Amino acid sequence: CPLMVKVLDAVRGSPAINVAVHVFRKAADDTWEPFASGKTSESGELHGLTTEEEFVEGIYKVEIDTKSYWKALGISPFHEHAEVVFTANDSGPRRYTIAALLSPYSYSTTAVVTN
Template sequence: MQQTHFVLLLLTAAAAAAPLHDASTPRELHQGPDPQCPLKVKILDAVQGTPAGSVVLKVHRRATSGTWTQVAAGVTDDTGEVHGLISEQQFPAGVYRVEFDTKTYWKSRGAAPFHEAVDVVFETHPEGPRQFTLALLLSPSSFTTTAVVHQ
């Protein structure tokens, strides 16, 4: 059991140190907040230690009734990122759910995934920050996520 935790810790550390872009991609797409894109997504494949391209995702907003409405969709590129996912006008304060189709991603790589999908639910506030980068680290049987909030 200790060995499993040690290997997972090493994988997580190695994946966190791996760059989320390659040298051929313009740096301005990957650095800091972008007023034209209030929600950015970056996904890293922890098994390969590379960006996770071709991951389908959907963004939903929760209505006051509690129902969810899809407001955006995208697919990660070769850098594991989605640009221009949602505009400022489409991203008012509220509760959002980003649904990542991880099952299709892992099956396309010959892996048997444990999760059907990864859902990340978060809330934005009118008086708070309006720029977010959602980062996801994936393996076939686990995931971790973090958000970078730009002031």
């Protein structure tokens, strides 16, 4: 699978489990079309979102529902969600891992693109 999402919790030092993730693909009219979604596993990962066939070049958005995660932990968060927007390119490495590190008032996101 060409796209994986990994989410970590910087407050507990653990995978961020059961975090909803929604992936969208930018349509010709500039709107965001639902593409794939899921919830992170006990390892904070979400595999099997798409296939090589369907994951064509284009602009994608990965929305991580961080607010609901923090609310479940009873911690007041800042962001509505974490959004990661990027262009999928065929010339570069073919496996994309979108990693996110979550804190209540901060998040970082990193792309690990490999062959």
